[PDB]
Design a binder for this molecule. Structure first.
Ligand SMILES: CN1CCN(C(=O)c2cc(-c3nnc4ccc(Br)cn34)c(O)cc2O)CC1
Length: 208
């Protein structure tokens, strides 16, 4: 297990998201679905010139999996997945300018719902989650687990759990007061409201 510090700008963004009073929290799901859709677009495009890239799974989709027992909501996609360098370096550097611009906007009166327009909507996960675990598998690398409860650091390790094939699974460990996002009709309402134009199937797994 390796522990890393977030880029300073991102640690500051995370602390702001965690500490600011903001009731419109449902936007997190829209942002995570939009990120999955982007990862799905990338594998779909790559597969046009090299169909062997889908050997690890031909189905391109998004699953939403609430678990009231564990208090987690999982967003799974079969997109391109992330390499170790993506997890440690790349996502951070690509987010840096967006993060700085977003913090500046928040100063000039802009609101948290605009986070997506700056390309850093992933961190809106911390509106509802006390901890986020991400399991990922890219065709060119091993399966990894990323995890952060914020506070300035994240961890990366090789994942010895169930094999994913290809893609990314975001597991939100929800804050005690945010269990509404585990409810079937609330999830449907949110997806219909924000995510009605995504070009891949989004399937809600209903709890038994
Ligand atoms: C460069 N790309 C983008 C998306 N992608 C992915 O595999 C991918 C990334 C994120 C994601 N978006 N922001 C972050 C931040 C930290 C972590 Br961990 C994951 N993040 C996500 O929610 C879903 C995804 O399918 C493929 C590779």
């Amino acid at each position: 297990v390796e522990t890393f510090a977030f880029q300073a700008e991102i640690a500051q963004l995370m602390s702001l998201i965690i500490n600011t009073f903001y009731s419109n929290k449902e936007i997190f799901l829209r942002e995570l679905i939009s990120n999955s859709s982007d990862a799905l677009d990338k594998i779909r495009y790559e597969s046009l010139t090299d169909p062997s890239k889908l050997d690890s799974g031909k189905e391109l989709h998004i699953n939403l999996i609430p678990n009231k027992q564990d208090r987690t909501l999982t967003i799974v996609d079969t997109g391109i997945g992330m390499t170790k360098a993506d997890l440690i370096n790349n996502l951070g550097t690509i987010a840096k300018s967006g993060t700085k611009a977003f913090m500046e906007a928040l100063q000039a009166g802009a609101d948290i719902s605009m986070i997506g327009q700056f390309g850093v909507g992933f961190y809106s996960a911390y509106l509802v989650a006390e901890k986020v675990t991400v399991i990922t598998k890219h065709n060119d690398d091993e399966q990894y687990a990323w995890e952060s409860s914020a506070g300035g650091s994240f961890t990366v390790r090789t994942d010895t759990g169930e094999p994913m094939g290809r893609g990314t699974k975001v597991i939100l460990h929800l804050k005690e007061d945010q269990t509404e996002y585990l409810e079937e009709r609330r999830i449907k309402e949110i997806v219909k409201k924000h995510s009605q134009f995504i070009g891949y199937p989004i399937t809600l797994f209903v709890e038994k």
